[PDB]
Structures are given as structure tokens and as C-alpha cells.
Ligand binder design. Sequence first.
Ligand SMILES: [Cl-]
Ligand SMILES: [Cl-]
Ligand SMILES: [Cl-]
Ligand SMILES: [Cl-]
Ligand SMILES: [Cl-]
Ligand SMILES: [Cl-]
Ligand SMILES: [Cl-]
Ligand SMILES: [Cl-]
Ligand code: NA
Ligand code: NA
Ligand code: NA
Length: 287
Amino acid sequence: GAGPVLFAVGGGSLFAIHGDCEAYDTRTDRWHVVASMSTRRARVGVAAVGNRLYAVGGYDGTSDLATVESYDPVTNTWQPEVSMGTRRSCLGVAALHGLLYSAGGYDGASCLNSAERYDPLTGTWTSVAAMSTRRRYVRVATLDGNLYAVGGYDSSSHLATVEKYEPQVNVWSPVASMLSRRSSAGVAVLEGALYVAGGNDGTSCLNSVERYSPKAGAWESVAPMNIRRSTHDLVAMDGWLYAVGGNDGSSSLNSIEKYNPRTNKWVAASCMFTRRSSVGVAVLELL
Ligand SMILES: [Cl-]
Ligand SMILES: [Cl-]
Ligand SMILES: [Cl-]
Ligand SMILES: [Cl-]
Ligand SMILES: [Cl-]
Ligand SMILES: [Cl-]
Ligand SMILES: [Cl-]
Ligand SMILES: [Cl-]
Ligand code: NA
Ligand code: NA
Ligand code: NA
């Protein structure tokens, strides 16, 4: 065998919030329309847990959502799940030891530093230790058994700071700060390194990319993307990085580019049907 399939869920465009979804087949470089969600969700957290898709929170054009829904690729369908304790748009979402974490975001009034976790067996959310920082527009990714919360926006500054959640003790700890301030960046783990691509640093949309090694605890610059992207998403697929959707500062992107770390190079791929900024992305193993 089963191969990786990329899923672009929700997002927005000019004056639009999407509920539709599409899937990218790496073998054929082709996109396929898949089941639409029950709710329109942009700025949604999307994570794969148990080879099932979870769309967490988001913004439906009027409200910041607490609701969650789930995608079954076998039947190609979505279903409701238990809602979070907080409404969260612009959040980070990741899978860790089989549990689904939601960190940071915006509840309609404040930038959140809180976090909670979902056990899909019991369908239950429990709060977890809060981050040291309010992190709107945060991204979250799992590396070596820890959660990494990357950049974001407290109510006033764009952040270059990073935290990591240790679940053995339920504690957030600082991580070396990135070389750049970034909100709405794309974040993904590839061959043991945490890649952060694009984002907005408070001044412009970024095409720069950096990566973090936990062994050293150090950040290192990497080839920039071909297109400046904020609110896009980043995912690891079959040895490559895929940067999906986002915004170049004016137009919502349907563009896709992929990063080969052996050549340190970015190359375009087949673009989506829909333009999706603040899009959720995840990878399933399917055959
Ligand atoms: Cl399918
Ligand atoms: Cl976002
Ligand atoms: Cl890992
Ligand atoms: Cl700032
Ligand atoms: Cl600075
Ligand atoms: Cl990833
Ligand atoms: Cl390859
Ligand atoms: Cl375009
Ligand atoms: Na806990
Ligand atoms: Na270290
Ligand atoms: Na490839």
C-alpha cells in the first residue's frame, strides 16, 4: 504494497470556505475528488490516526469550530466525532502514540496556549499541560516521541520560538528558536528532521525553509520553495516533502511543490482542482 495518498481537506479561497476534499495519487500524479465534509472548515487541523483522517476545529466563515469529523477511506465518507473542549481555528494538530493532540489556535477572542488530546477508542478529549506561549497560527508535528509546536502568533508578535511536549511527564519545554519568525508555516518530519517551510514573519510571505535536528538541537537553512506560501501545509510522502496550497500573499494557491532532500531541490507537481488557503493535509496508506 500500500502506498501513500495525499489528502487536501477544506481550506478557503477569495470569499469562500470549502467543505470539499481531494486526494493525490503519487503513482499517477493525479488528483481525485473525495467525499466532502459535513462542515465547511478553513484553518482546520488535519491529522491521520489509525489510517483515518481527522478534521479538527477550523472556521466555517462565521464561527471558530469545536466540532470534529473523521474520514474513512474504505467507504470514502465523513462522520461526526466528539467535539473539543475549546473552539479552535488556526490550530496545530498531530498524532502521538496513537492519540490525537490539538494545540494552540484561536477561539474567537483569544489566542490559545491550551492543548487537549483525543482517544479515538473511547472517543474522549482530555486537557493536557498548556504551552508556555499563546500560539495562534501554530503548527504541530511529532518527532522522536515529542510534540513540536512551531512558531505562531501570540496576540501581538509573530513567533520564532518552538516548544516540545513530553507526554511521559506531561510537560512543555523550550526548543531552539528558528532562524525566522513564522506563522501559518508548513511543518513536517522527514528522515528524522523537522522541516518548517514558508509562513508569514510579520513583514512578507516567506519562501524560505529551515530544518531542525533534535540530536544537535540546531536549525539549518535549506533550499527555499519556488513559490512563497503562508497557511499552506507540508507533508512527508515517500521520501519527499510536499507543500500543498496556501497563499502567495494575493491568490489562494492550488499549486503543489515537492522537495527532494538528496538534491536539496524543489520541483512543481500536479496542482489541485481547488484553490485552498489554510488547508488541512494528511497522508493515508492505501491500496
Ligand atoms: Cl478513497
Ligand atoms: Cl492557518
Ligand atoms: Cl518519530
Ligand atoms: Cl512581530
Ligand atoms: Cl527579529
Ligand atoms: Cl509529517
Ligand atoms: Cl524517490
Ligand atoms: Cl495562480
Ligand atoms: Na493529561
Ligand atoms: Na538537545
Ligand atoms: Na516522488
